[PDB]
Amino acid sequence: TPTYAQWENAAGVLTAGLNSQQANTLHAFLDESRSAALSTYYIRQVAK
Amino acid sequence: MQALHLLGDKPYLPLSTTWSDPRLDRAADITTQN
Amino acid sequence: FNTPLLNGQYFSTGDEEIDLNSGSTGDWRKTILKRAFNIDDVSLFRLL
Amino acid sequence: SKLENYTKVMEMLSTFRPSGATPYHDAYENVREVIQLQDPGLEQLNASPAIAGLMHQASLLGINASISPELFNILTEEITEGNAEELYKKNFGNIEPASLAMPEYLKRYYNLSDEELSQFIGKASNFGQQEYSNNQLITPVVNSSDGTVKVYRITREYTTNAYQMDVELFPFGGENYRLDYKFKNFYNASYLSIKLNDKRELVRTEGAPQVNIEYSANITLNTADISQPFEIGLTRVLPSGSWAYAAAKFTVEEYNQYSFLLKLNKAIRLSRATELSPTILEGIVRSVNLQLD
């Protein structure tokens, strides 16, 4: 199975081809997903 | 948010219950007391 | 180059050497160049 | 976490399976979103047979369904008793299954909606074992007095004339049960009488029960009953007053929630990842296995 570095490399190569409008939408979606994941992990593992 | 914490936790209400789909005849006889 | 940040990596001038060969599959810096210039690897080498 | 750089953190997060909205594979999400911007539906991928054939179908297709590779490892896992006690350690870590049994805690944990949780809790009656195995049935039961889920082990024990029949018991509520039974031999009953042991008659059926018919009864068994290793005594009484009596004991035990919570976790995460209704997924799972697996 592809290791995370392979995935991150593919993500970067694929992202380099996008335009400003599509990059803006991609970054907004990524930020929302990252926020959900980080909030859940913080609740489980960092919250006192 | 000020009104939100005043209301507090919305109560959970399970849809699965002890209510047995009773017959109208039987529900009426049961509720006929007093 | 630096915005938006790519995989939490900050791009700046350095003494390291970056490959512009299209078939070389360069590091994240080549991806930064491609994203900044909005071009693919083959056209990047052609521009070089 | 003792992690300094961003990509090490996102690598950690890509596999942090014990938390309620991880594992979160960021590079995979970026790739999927880029693909669904650049070629919605992979029309160009599928229009090129060579490229589509360099991939497996299940790999390109599993990028539509938003199943990350660690989520794929979660959903593939062979949950069974004898590993559920440590796959709970893998998939939930330190939260006690008694706390996570409460619907409010679990809804907060998965960040679910109330109506979203309600249909999973209906499906919970399916989440158990679907049939008796080794004379055991292990099943959740919702205590509707507070909505909490309780797992019961029912252990069958044929006591009397087991050559007459098979008999099976399936709870659905507090002291509320379905009893199923299926005869092996024919006796021309004037009626069929079924009792708790030979004592409290829970149901009676007139006429002769036939061979190879699964009859059923929505019996009740109460706390002072089910605390015992009680018998259930069935009795085909013939017009002569002769009978084909037969019976089995059914021990009822309360049981750990591990194998329940792991299946509910698979169901919630699959429904959320594929944005498909739980009813749809339940209608899909039955077309592979008669066990919801």
Distance CA B4, CA B10 (A): 10
DSSP-derived pairing of the beta strands D136-143 and D148-160: antiparallel
DSSP for chain D, written as a single string: ----SHHHHHHHHHT-TTSSS----HHHHHHHHHHHHHSGGGHHHHHSHHHHHHS-HHHHHHHHTT--HHHHHHHH----TTTHHHHHHHHTTTS-HHHHHSHHHHHHHHT--HHHHHHHHHHHHHHS-SS-BTTEEEEEEEETTTTEEEEEEEEEEEEE-TTSEEEEEEEEETTEEEEEEEESS----SEEEEEEBTTEEEEEEESPPPBT-EEEE--B--HHHHTS--EEEEEEE-TTS-EEEEEEEEEEEEE-SHHHHHHHHHHHHHHHHTT--HHHHHHHHTTT-SS--
Cβ of residue B14 closer than 8 Å to a chain D Cβ: yes
Nearest residue to D142 via CA among D160, D117, D112? D117
- Tell me the shortest Cα–Cα distance from D48 to chain A, in angstroms: 18
For helices D258-273 and D114-127, the axis angle rounded to 10 degrees is 130
Mutate to test the interface with A, among D8, D30, D38, D91 (most CBs of A within 10 A): D30
- Tell me the shortest Cα–Cα distance from D172 to chain A, in angstroms: 33
Distance CA A33, CA D13 (A): 12
**Residue B18 DSSP code:** S
What is the H or E stretch that residue A5 is in?
helix A4-16
The set of residues, in sequence order, having a beta carbon less than 8 Å from that of D191 and lying 6+ positions away, is D204, D205, D206, D207, D237
Cβ of residue B17 closer than 8 Å to a chain D Cβ: yes
For chain B, what is the largest distance between any 2 Cα atoms, rounded to a whole number of angstroms? 49
Where do we find the tokens 């698979």?
A: D266
The set of residues, in sequence order, having a beta carbon less than 8 Å from that of C16 and lying 6+ positions away, is C29
End-to-end Cα, chain C, rounded Å: 17
Q: Do A26 and D26 touch (CB under 8 A)?
A: no
Experiment type: cryo-EM
Nearest residue to A7 via CA among D30, B6, C29? D30
Cβ contacts (< 8 Å) between B12 and chain D: which residues? 103-104, 107, 114, 117, 147
- Tell me the shortest Cα–Cα distance from A47 to chain C, in angstroms: 24
Touch criterion met for C and B (3+ Cβ pairs within 8 Å): no
Q: Do B16 and D173 touch (CB under 8 A)?
A: yes
The set of residues, in sequence order, having a beta carbon less than 8 Å from that of D34 and lying 6+ positions away, is A11, A14, A15, A17, A18, A26
Task: Return the residue of C nearest to D6 by Cα.
Answer: C8
**Residue C16 DSSP code:** S
Burial class from Cβ neighbours inside 10 Å (0-12, 13-18, 19+) for residue A29 reads middle
Q: Which two tokens stand for residue D120?
A: 């999973």
